[PDB]
RNA sequence: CCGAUAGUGAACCAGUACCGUGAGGGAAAGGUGAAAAGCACCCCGGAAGGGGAGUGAAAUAGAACCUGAAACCGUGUGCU
RNA sequence: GUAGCGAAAGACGGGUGAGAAUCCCGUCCACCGAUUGACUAAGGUUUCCAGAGGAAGGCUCGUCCGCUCUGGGUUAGUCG
């Protein structure tokens, strides 16, 4: 039912990235992909690079029915972080922050 | 003018509430096009 | 005697342009001059000279992964003769 | 009026040499505000051109620029010629307008609520 | 602004450097120093 | 007698990177698998990353790789 | 998601490419103007150039880079 795909360590914070991915929560891909496409952050294409990669899996293997195909869930969580610098005349510091993504995406059924 | 207290986890997200967005209108295109939304020209299929 | 003393012949675009004309390079020993350069390959390749410079080069630095270093200096050495060629490659 | 925050020489130089090149295209891709206000200018403009004298042609010259379109067949005029003889007589009726304009999606580098104007 | 440090090679080599401290005993105390803490470095 | 915040400063790139005009100070940094047998081939992706496939006793054993705590961050959820 | 994002007029088109405010070509405009100009010294030590490259870096971006990789590059009797 359920296909899958992972974005591994992407360089925005889920703090920055949430609240684009706490709309399609409960969607279909139609919708969805549009929605993607039509606001203007930077997470949407990647966001939709990665579903189109998921369907990809879903289709090229497991062969199910597209448009019945709903969000399963979608979400992600922290990654590993890295550190720089401001010169300023002395010392200063940063954190480079990034992001591990999950969707799956189900026919809604078993 | 700096904290004196901690933020609170309960007060942090309790503040985040309206730090949303929302969305895009998103009809069909009736005049002339695909699903393009309400009076749209062809960003993708649009009329107006 | 002579043959430790030229350890290569260079070879690159500005050496084929050199080549050209009776413009050749080397990279020689580091310790050398003109005259005894000149005094050695003129009877080594059984030819003569009319004239030659010289320059020198650093260490270009260098690194791989965790482990780096430098390069050699290099008597980079060049000589334009006169007479006869070579039969080179 | 509108501002834009740019400043006031800066801006005059900017509209005009703007509107120059609109009329080099005749369409072309940029903000919104900033074609909004070339809007009224180069109506104003083929307004001028409308009437062919040589007072309108003066004072197209304050505002115009000293260019050259390779026109067609490697031929040559400027933008002056072009409105005094090639589009006057086109819009030679019209009572308004005279363009028009096509809001588009925004940008990348910001979020520019972009613009392709054109002609009408 | 003017600050500390306005290089020399010579001047820096001269306060310190090989023929330098090896002219005296109290100079010459510390070479083995570097050499018994098996400090890679010299002047 | 200690078993990687120990044990010597240093189990690895150690008097080293680094700092210091200068003497002088002075770090951090161990663990795939029995066997690399280290993911053939397809799909997406600009790629990177992936999902399958395939390996292996095992891949929540995939090279940063033994387990993998807690702070912390998330998603669901029953009562609110 | 706060404060802040360091001094010098940009605009359009064309191109570029997966992808362009930030790269390229162009036209105009603008600024320095005893100089943000050119020379030499020290000092810096290959940052140079020809390609190739996004990974990391670049205070945004990035098809570019004083980032990386590769390969090249400094010629003297008079100059010093």
């Known amino acids: ?42 997470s949407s294409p990647v966001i939709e690079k990665v579903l189109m990669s998921a369907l990809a899996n879903a289709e090229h293997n497991y062969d199910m029915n597209t448009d019945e195909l709903v969000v399963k869930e979608a979400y992600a969580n922290e990654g590993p972080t890295l550190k720089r610098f401001r010169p300023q005349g002395r010392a200063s510091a940063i954190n480079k922050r990034t992001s591990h993504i999950t969707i799956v995406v189900s026919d809604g059924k078993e | 003018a700096v904290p004196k207290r901690r933020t609170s986890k309960t007060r942090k997200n309790k503040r985040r509430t309206h730090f949303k967005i929302s969305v895009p209108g998103m009809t069909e295109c009736p005049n002339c096009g695909e699903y393009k939304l309400s009076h749209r020209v062809c960003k993708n299929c649009g009329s107006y | 005697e002579a043959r430790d003393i030229l350890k290569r012949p260079v070879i690159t675009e500005k050496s084929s342009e050199a080549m050209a004309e009776d413009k050749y390079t080397f990279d020689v020993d580091t310790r050398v001059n003109k005259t005894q350069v ?22 270009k630095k260098k690194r791989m992964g965790r482990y780096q270093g430098y390069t050699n200096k290099r008597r980079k050495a060049i000589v334009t003769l006169k007479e006869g060629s070579i039969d080179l490659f | ?30 903000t919104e505000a900033r074609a909004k206000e070339v809007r009224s200018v180069v ?62 999606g925004p940008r990348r580098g910001d979020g520019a609520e972009s613009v392709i104007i054109e002609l009408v | 602004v003017k600050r500390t440090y306005q290089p020399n090679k010579r001047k820096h080599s001269k306060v310190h450097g090989f023929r330098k401290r090896m002219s005296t005993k109290n100079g010459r105390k510390v070479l083995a120093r570097r050499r018994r803490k098996g400090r890679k470095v010299l002047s």
Do not use: H
């Open chain 1, 1 to 42: 039912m359920e296909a899958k795909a992972v974005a591994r360590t992407i360089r925005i914070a889920p703090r920055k990235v949430r609240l684009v991915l706490d709309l399609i929560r409960g969607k279909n891909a139609a919708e969805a992909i549009a929605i993607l496409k039509l606001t203007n952050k930077a």
């Open chain 3, 38 to 59: 000149k005094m050695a390959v003129e009877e080594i390749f059984n030819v003569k000279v009319a004239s030659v410079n010289i320059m020198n080069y650093k260490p």
């Open chain 4, 1 to 30: 009026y509108r501002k834009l925050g740019r400043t006031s020489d800066q801006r005059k130089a900017m509209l005009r040499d703007l509107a120059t090149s609109l009329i080099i295209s005749e369409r072309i891709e940029t």
């Open chain 4, 43 to 104: 109506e104003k403009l083929i307004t001028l051109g409308k009437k062919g004298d040589l007072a309108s042609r003066r004072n197209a010259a304050k505002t115009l620029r000293n260019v050259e379109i390779l026109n067609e067949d490697e031929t040559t005029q400027t933008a002056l010629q072009k409105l005094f003889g090639e589009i006057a007589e086109r819009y030679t009726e019209r009572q308004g307008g005279y363009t028009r304009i096509l809001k588009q």
